[PDB]
Amino acid sequence: SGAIYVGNYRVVNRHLATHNDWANLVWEDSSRDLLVSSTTAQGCDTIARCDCQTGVYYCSSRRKHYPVSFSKPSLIFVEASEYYPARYQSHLMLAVGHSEPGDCGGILRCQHGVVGIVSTGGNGLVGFADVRDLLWLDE
Ligand SMILES: COc1cccc(SC)c1NC(=O)N1CCC[C@H](C(N)=O)C1
Ligand SMILES: [Zn+2]
């Protein structure tokens, strides 16, 4: 669990989206595992606009923040799950680090702000769905 709250938007994992996220849908992309919904209150998270490859993420299965080097956003194959069939997920970044299924939603940050959120993992790896390209989140 976990979300990004910026202005009148809430960015969540598409597979974890609630009824209210769909009843107030702005944009959703199953290939990126992202869903953005509208909010009644103003959010205050700052989104980063950069090409950073180092940052810190929150791991709820360890109650700990961890520093990571991560890859540039790209198409990476993700094995079949109860949410999606076997496919390439786009705009995905990998790092060496611990993650478990309940870790989706944890924020990845750098000195410029919010980079993305935990979306995939396993075998000593962790995947993050990038949001730095969604320039509309700020306007
Ligand atoms: C069950 O495999 C894992 C093992 C450790 C950590 C994790 S992060 C939950 C996972 N989960 C995944 O990578 N999945 C399942 C959840 C949806 C993900 C997607 N982007 O389609 C793919
Ligand atoms: Zn940055």
Swiss-Prot record:
Relate the protein's function as given in its record.
Answer: Cysteine protease that cleaves viral polyprotein and specific host proteins. It is responsible for the autocatalytic cleavage between the P1 and P2 regions, which is the first cleavage occurring in the polyprotein. Also cleaves the host translation initiation factor EIF4G1, in order to shut down the capped cellular mRNA translation. Inhibits the host nucleus-cytoplasm protein and RNA trafficking by cleaving host members of the nuclear pores. Counteracts stress granule formation probably by antagonizing its assembly or promoting its dissassembly.
In this chain, Zn(2+) 1 is annotated as bound at: C50, C52, C110, H112
Q: Which domain of life is it from?
A: Viruses
Name of the protein: Protease 2A
Q: How does it assemble?
A: Homodimer.
The scientific name of the source species is Coxsackievirus A16 (strain G-10)
Span of the entire protein shown here: 869 to 1007 of 2193
Active site positions: H15 (for protease 2a activity), D33 (for protease 2a activity), C104 (for protease 2a activity)
Reactions catalysed, semicolon-separated, are:
Selective cleavage of Tyr-|-Gly bond in the picornavirus polyprotein
Lineage, please? Viruses, Riboviria, Orthornavirae, Pisuviricota, Pisoniviricetes
